[PDB]
Amino acid sequence: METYDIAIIGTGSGNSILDERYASKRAAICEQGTFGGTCLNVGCIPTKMFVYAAEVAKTIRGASRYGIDAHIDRVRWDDVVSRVFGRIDPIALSGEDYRRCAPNIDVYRTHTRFGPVQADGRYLLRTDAGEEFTAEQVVIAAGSRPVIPPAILASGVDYHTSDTVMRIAELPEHIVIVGSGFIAAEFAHVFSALGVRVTLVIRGSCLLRHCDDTICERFTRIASTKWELRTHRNVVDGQQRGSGVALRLDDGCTINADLLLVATGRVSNADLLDAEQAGVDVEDGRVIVDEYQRTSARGVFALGDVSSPYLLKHVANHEARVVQHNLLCDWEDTQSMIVTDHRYVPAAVFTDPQIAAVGLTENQAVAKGLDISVKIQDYGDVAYGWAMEDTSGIVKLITERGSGRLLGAHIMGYQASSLIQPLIQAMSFGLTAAEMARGQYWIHPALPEVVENALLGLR
Amino acid sequence: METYDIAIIGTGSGNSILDERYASKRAAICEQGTFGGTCLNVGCIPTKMFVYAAEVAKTIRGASRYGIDAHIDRVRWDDVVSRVFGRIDPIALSGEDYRRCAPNIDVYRTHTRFGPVQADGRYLLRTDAGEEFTAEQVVIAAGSRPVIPPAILASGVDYHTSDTVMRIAELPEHIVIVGSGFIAAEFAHVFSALGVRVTLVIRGSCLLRHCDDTICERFTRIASTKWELRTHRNVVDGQQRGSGVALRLDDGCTINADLLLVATGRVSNADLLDAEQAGVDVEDGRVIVDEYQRTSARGVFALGDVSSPYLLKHVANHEARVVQHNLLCDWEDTQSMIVTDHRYVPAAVFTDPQIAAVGLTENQAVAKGLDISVKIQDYGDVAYGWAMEDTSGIVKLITERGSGRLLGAHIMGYQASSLIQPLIQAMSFGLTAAEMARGQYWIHPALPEVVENALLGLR
Numbered sequence: 001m002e003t004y005d006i007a008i009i010g011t012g013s014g015n016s017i018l019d020e021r022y023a024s025k026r027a028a029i030c031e032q033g034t035f036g037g038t039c040l041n042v043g044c045i046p047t048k049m050f051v052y053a054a055e056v057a058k059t060i061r062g063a064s065r066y067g068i069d070a071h072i073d074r075v076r077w078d079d080v081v082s083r084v085f086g087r088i089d090p091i092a093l094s095g096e097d098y099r100r101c102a103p104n105i106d107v108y109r110t111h112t113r114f115g116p117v118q119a120d121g122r123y124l125l126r127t128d129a130g131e132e133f134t135a136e137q138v139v140i141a142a143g144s145r146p147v148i149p150p151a152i153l154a155s156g157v158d159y160h161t162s163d164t165v166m167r168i169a170e171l172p173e174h175i176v177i178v179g180s181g182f183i184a185a186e187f188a189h190v191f192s193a194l195g196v197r198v199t200l201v202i203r204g205s206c207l208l209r210h211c212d213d214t215i216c217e218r219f220t221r222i223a224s225t226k227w228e229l230r231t232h233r234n235v236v237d238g239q240q241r242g243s244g245v246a247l248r249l250d251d252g253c254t255i256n257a258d259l260l261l262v263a264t265g266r267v268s269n270a271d272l273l274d275a276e277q278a279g280v281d282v283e284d285g286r287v288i289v290d291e292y293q294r295t296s297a298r299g300v301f302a303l304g305d306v307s308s309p310y311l312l313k314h315v316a317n318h319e320a321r322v323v324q325h326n327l328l329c330d331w332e333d334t335q336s337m338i339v340t341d342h343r344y345v346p347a348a349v350f351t352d353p354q355i356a357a358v359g360l361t362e363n364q365a366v367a368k369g370l371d372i373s374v375k376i377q378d379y380g381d382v383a384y385g386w387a388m389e390d391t392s393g394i395v396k397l398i399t400e401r402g403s404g405r406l407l408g409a410h411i412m413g414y415q416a417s418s419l420i421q422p423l424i425q426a427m428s429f430g431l432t433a434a435e436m437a438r439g440q441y442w443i444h445p446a447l448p449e450v451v452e453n454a455l456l457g458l459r
Numbered sequence: 460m461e462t463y464d465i466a467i468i469g470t471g472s473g474n475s476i477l478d479e480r481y482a483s484k485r486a487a488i489c490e491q492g493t494f495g496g497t498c499l500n501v502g503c504i505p506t507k508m509f510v511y512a513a514e515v516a517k518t519i520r521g522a523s524r525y526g527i528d529a530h531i532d533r534v535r536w537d538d539v540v541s542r543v544f545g546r547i548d549p550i551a552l553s554g555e556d557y558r559r560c561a562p563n564i565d566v567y568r569t570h571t572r573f574g575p576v577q578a579d580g581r582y583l584l585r586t587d588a589g590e591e592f593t594a595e596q597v598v599i600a601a602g603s604r605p606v607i608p609p610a611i612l613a614s615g616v617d618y619h620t621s622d623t624v625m626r627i628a629e630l631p632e633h634i635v636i637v638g639s640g641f642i643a644a645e646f647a648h649v650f651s652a653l654g655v656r657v658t659l660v661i662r663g664s665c666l667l668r669h670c671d672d673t674i675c676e677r678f679t680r681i682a683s684t685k686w687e688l689r690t691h692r693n694v695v696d697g698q699q700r701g702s703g704v705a706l707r708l709d710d711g712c713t714i715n716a717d718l719l720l721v722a723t724g725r726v727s728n729a730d731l732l733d734a735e736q737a738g739v740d741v742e743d744g745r746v747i748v749d750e751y752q753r754t755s756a757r758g759v760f761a762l763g764d765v766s767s768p769y770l771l772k773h774v775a776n777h778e779a780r781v782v783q784h785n786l787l788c789d790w791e792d793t794q795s796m797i798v799t800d801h802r803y804v805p806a807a808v809f810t811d812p813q814i815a816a817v818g819l820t821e822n823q824a825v826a827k828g829l830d831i832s833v834k835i836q837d838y839g840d841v842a843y844g845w846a847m848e849d850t851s852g853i854v855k856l857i858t859e860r861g862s863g864r865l866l867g868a869h870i871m872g873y874q875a876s877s878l879i880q881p882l883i884q885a886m887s888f889g890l891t892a893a894e895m896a897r898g899q900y901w902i903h904p905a906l907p908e909v910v911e912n913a914l915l916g917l918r
């Protein structure tokens with residue numbers, strides 16, 4: 001049996017731990033799926049490439065608004081898939097060989113579960129391929145997996161998730177997306193812009209409800225005019241309809257479609273580790289960690305979707321950096337360790353219109369009894385918005401009336417994830433709204449003027 | 460004769476001075492040209508509207524890069540002009556009516572010259588219409604006017620400037636642009652993207668020479684591959700060739716074209732004021748002002764292109780704010796006045812690729828003997844750049860190695876004017892590169908990641 005100084009489960013954000021500082025130790029890497037994690041292979045990077053390709057098609061279709069009459073002759077979907085994954089798939093091979101060919105690193109490519117903690121304090125790890133080995137330190141970065149509604153599993157219908165929908169052979173004529181989350185909105189924008197009729201079947205009343213209500217309400221109205229939104233509906237049964245699918249709803253209605261996409265959330269992969277049998281506490285389906293990303297077991301850390309409350313890559317990268325530093329520190333030297341910063345976590349939704357948010361919502365600030373001022377600035381009231389002929393883009397700012405510092409920022413419009421970065425900077429470093437608006441220059445007539453005027457209107 | 464408490468020459472940024480604090484005084488406004496200033500009518504706002512329409516056409520034309528085959532059927536230039544100026548022209552009329560209809564404000568629509576200072580200390584102003592009136596305070600906001608090379612004036616050829624080129628009836632087949640400045644680059648991007656053959660005739664060796672050399676070298680190479688760039692050339696003569704023009708260059712060659720556009724710089728309108736006869740100092744062709752926007756004449760302020768070293772609207776607006784505040788203070792109470800801030804003045808060039816810069820260039824920092832670190836990060840090394848398939852976009856950052864503070868930032872690529880805003884914020888408030896890179900979150904996989912990775916690389 002083998003012995004290792006450190007073992008890492010998951011090649012997503014956990015792959016960014018083995019520095020040159022571990023060149024003198026032996027490490028074991030576990031990856032049951034494709035090397036590189038979810039975001040690289042079937043996550044952020046592939047999706048945002050399809051989003052950009054869809055936005056090019058959307059620009060062509062609405063070009064007459066600006067005086068240019070054009071039309072799409074063809075959508076070479078096969079070349080779009082080959083272009084995206086022709087770049088991504090080789091990264092998984094070269095990144096995997098980078099670990100195998102290293103003599104200090106061993107790579108196990110099967111599902112790895114925790115075993116009983118050995119008498120000498122080292123952790124036993126066992127794979128589904130039959131291998132068994134020990135490790136002194138262990139890093140848990142198992143990520144998350146998609147969740148499919150139980151009624152859809154019982155029906156046995158052919159369905160797709162975010163893991164498999166991007167490598168489909170041909171673009172369908174009609175798609176039904178079940179879910180109201182970040183994935184559901186992003187893919188609805190991708191397919192509708194590429195010429196697909198999109199049908200949303202959501203159980204709630206708003207799309208992207210975990211965002212500020214001003215954003216969800218306005219975005220759902222816009223989405224309902226270009227996609228068929230069926231609110232307060234759940235899929236209860238279904239059957240095969242040739243290559244397509246027929247889905248029965250909870251009101252007796254039946255929807256015929258060519259493709260089913262499920263985007264009803266993801267769940268951490270902690271419940272498939274037997275970690276509690278090895279001393280790691282698990283609440284809900286997640287691994288409990290403290291501000292140093294330390295678990296309830298000595299020498300065992302966790303990061304990413306398996307433990308963090310935010311299922312975001314920029315958060316998983318920050319947590320991986322904390323684990324990378326705290327692994328070289330003594331387990332009890334907490335004052336020499338680094339603390340994970342979750343104070344101003346932002347997030348973006350790459351839909352049309354684009355959504356980006358950071359901090360508290362208006363209702364979240366009211367629930368905390370904070371005295372706030374709120375301004376909602378329109379894109380169309382800015383010189384750059386005039387060139388866009390924009391009539392729906394808004395920027396929402398919430399400030400604490402006492403200190404005058406930014407409490408939350410919510411942008412729904414063009415370049416939302418880029419426009420919010422100056423607001424992320426002010427919140428993270430404690431810059432007041434008054435200082436941010438006039439204590440610096442804003443390029444005229446650039447787009448960020450909509451953020452400047454949003455700060456100025458905070459009366 | 461008439462008497463006024465304050466007189467303002469120019470309805471550009473100077474029009475944004477008379478608030479309700481002057482509602483109890485009598486004011487005289489002078490506007491020899493069209494009401495609203497240059498930026499509203501024939502400047503930033505109209506140009507950037509045509510720029511956005513050009514980006515729509517170029518997106519359609521290069522859509523095959525992403526798998527969508529499309530083509531422009533027609534470019535309705537007539538509808539583009541009517542859409543742009545259909546928004547702008549009524550603003551000039553309603554904004555002018557807003558001032559005339561006010562009983563405390565009178566608007567003079569002819570060129571206003573300075574007269575001899577009256578015995579009572581008040582300034583005399585006379586218009587070409589024969590009217591004469593006096594004013595206690597005077598605000599100078601005469602702006603600038605285009606400069607035409609003397610060889611072009613001597614030829615007597617029909618030419619266009621930025622003031623008149625946007626109202627052309629029909630899109631030309633071939634255009635020759637004389638100049639290598641901000642206006643020349645922006646219109647070359649506008650017309651070439653709409654299908655016009657663009658020929659640049661510049662006397663220097665780089666386009667946008669007053670920018671960082673890394674930007675000038677790379678942008679000129681890119682621009683020379685899609686526009687016909689003739690470097691080290693001047694127009695010496697010309698004559699009419701039907702509706703078009705033929706221009707002889709300083710090397711004997713002759714260029715035939717359908718439209719001539721001159722963009723060889725602007726000069727302040729101070730030399731048309733007779734200001735020295737009334738006590739206002741004039742060096743070069745600019746009005747001399749201090750850090751309080753005060754001229755050499757008591758009670759006379761100045762702002763905008765007539766005095767500022769920066770011919771930018773966001774700078775002219777900041778100087779107009781200083782004049783607005785310092786007018787209500789005593790002329791000798793300099794300690795109660797506000798100082799004009801010209802630290803870290805940014806600027807953008809709305810070309811393809813887009814250019815935005817703030818602070819010092821690498822060579823300017825070397826001339827000051829500063830110990831600097833420089834990093835040039837490529838758009839293509841970021842997940843968002845992968846979706847764009849970008850192969851030329853760069854962001855260049857210069858920091859002082861001692862303090863770790865940003866000295867200059869130069870971006871050439873997509874959304875350059877939007878990505879530069881966080882860098883403008885860090886420079887304006889004294890945030891170090893290390894703090895900005897890791898003391899805040901960056902949304903994955905958004906575009907500002909190219910700025911984050913640029914900050915990390917300043918080894």
Ligand SMILES: Cc1cc2nc3c(=O)[nH]c(=O)nc-3n(C[C@H](O)[C@H](O)[C@H](O)COP(=O)(O)OP(=O)(O)OC[C@H]3O[C@@H](n4cnc5c(N)ncnc54)[C@H](O)[C@@H]3O)c2cc1C
Nearest residue numbers: 010012013032033037038039112142143304305311312313
């Ligand atoms: C479609 C989609 C789009 C997204 N877009 C964004 C976005 O724009 N921005 C953003 O910030 N986030 C986005 N995310 C979220 C992002 O994927 C995660 O936040 C992030 O990748 C978490 O990284 P991780 O390493 O913890 O998870 P993963 O990358 O999933 O790492 C876990 C890996 O380890 C493997 N593994 C799990 N358990 C075991 C085991 N027991 N043994 C061996 N191997 C195991 C898994 O198969 C997987 O390969 C998106 C997610 C999806 C699904």
Ligand SMILES: Cc1cc2nc3c(=O)[nH]c(=O)nc-3n(C[C@H](O)[C@H](O)[C@H](O)COP(=O)(O)OP(=O)(O)OC[C@H]3O[C@@H](n4cnc5c(N)ncnc54)[C@H](O)[C@@H]3O)c2cc1C
Nearest residue numbers: 469471472491492496497502571601602763764770771772
């Ligand atoms: C094509 C173009 C594009 C530009 N793009 C940008 C850009 O993207 N960003 C940016 O920041 N800046 C830009 N600028 C510069 C911007 O227009 C000016 O810096 C800004 O308008 C300065 O304002 P001002 O009031 O001083 O000048 P103006 O707005 O020109 O004000 C002067 C006005 O007073 C009138 N006047 C002058 N003399 C007299 C007199 N004796 N009597 C009566 N009236 C008089 C003039 O006719 C004019 O109407 C651009 C300029 C041009 C020409």
Ligand SMILES: NC(=O)c1ccc[n+]([C@@H]2O[C@H](COP(=O)([O-])OP(=O)(O)OC[C@H]3O[C@@H](n4cnc5c(N)ncnc54)[C@H](OP(=O)(O)O)[C@@H]3O)[C@@H](O)[C@H]2O)c1
Nearest residue numbers: 149179180181182183184203204263264265266311348349
């Ligand atoms: N760009 C990005 O930052 C990005 C992109 C993609 C994903 N993500 C992240 O990835 C994670 C998962 O994304 P996701 O879109 O799958 O989930 P999500 O964002 O958490 O939203 C999932 C949604 O599924 C709906 N749902 C659940 N069960 C359902 C059922 N049985 N029937 C109908 N609807 C049901 C819920 O609607 P109700 O709430 O009304 O019940 C819920 O809001 C999240 O952390 C998300 O933020 C981020």
Ligand SMILES: NC(=O)c1ccc[n+]([C@@H]2O[C@H](COP(=O)([O-])OP(=O)(O)OC[C@H]3O[C@@H](n4cnc5c(N)ncnc54)[C@H](OP(=O)(O)O)[C@@H]3O)[C@@H](O)[C@H]2O)c1
Nearest residue numbers: 608638639640641642662663668722723724725770806807
């Ligand atoms: N978005 C913006 O911020 C924006 C947009 C438009 C305009 N502006 C500003 O508004 C003004 C517009 O000026 P502009 O764009 O017309 O010009 P400019 O950018 O000021 O410079 C034009 C250039 O033309 C060259 N030139 C000068 N005289 C010439 C001659 N006789 N023959 C041939 N070439 C000659 C020079 O190149 P060399 O310097 O290499 O000799 C000169 O610098 C500037 O202040 C500009 O910065 C700003």
